């Protein structure tokens, strides 16, 4: 509903992939765990917690899914490329 406030610049690089209207960026396990922490108390990962210790990778992903309909974001725990609607929920594979 709302817009995540803009945290200055230095946005992590998102690789354009017009081959399938997709995009690739390496986030890491800390973000994929943090966002997994985000969607467990009813909270939001698209725009909530603007003063986060790891807000930057969260803010870019939100714009990236708007720019690209089938984003391809890869973690490091297993290195899987979860897609845009696979990134929609915030629950990746397992765990509470």
């Amino acid at each position: 509903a709302k817009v995540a406030p803009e945290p200055e610049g230095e946005l992590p690089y998102v690789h354009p992939l017009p081959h399938r209207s997709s995009a690739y960026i390496w986030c890491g396990w800390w973000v994929m765990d943090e966002i997994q922490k985000m969607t467990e108390e009813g909270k939001d990962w698209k725009t909530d917690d603007p003063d986060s210790k790891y807000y930057l990778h969260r803010y870019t992903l939100q714009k990236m899914m708007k720019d690209y309909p089938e984003v391809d974001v890869q973690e490091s725990r297993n290195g899987y490329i979860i897609h845009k609607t696979a990134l929609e929920t915030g629950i990746i594979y397992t765990y509470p």
Binding site: L17, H19, R20, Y24, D72, Q74, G79, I81
Partner: protein
């Protein structure tokens, strides 16, 4: 053509495209994707020139 993965860019091998590198993580396995692509390309010469 016959050497193309269906989700690739059909003429360029991209070291940042997970379809091109078959989901390889790290440089250590990202390069062997290029190796396999070179092999895949070579046989196509054998199929066309005979």
């Amino acid at each position: 053509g016959m050497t193309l993965t269906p989700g690739s860019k059909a003429g360029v091998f991209d070291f940042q495209d997970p379809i091109d590198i078959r989901g390889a993580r790290w440089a250590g396995e990202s390069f062997k994707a290029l190796l396999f692509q070179i092999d895949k390309e070579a046989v196509e010469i054998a199929r066309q020139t005979g």
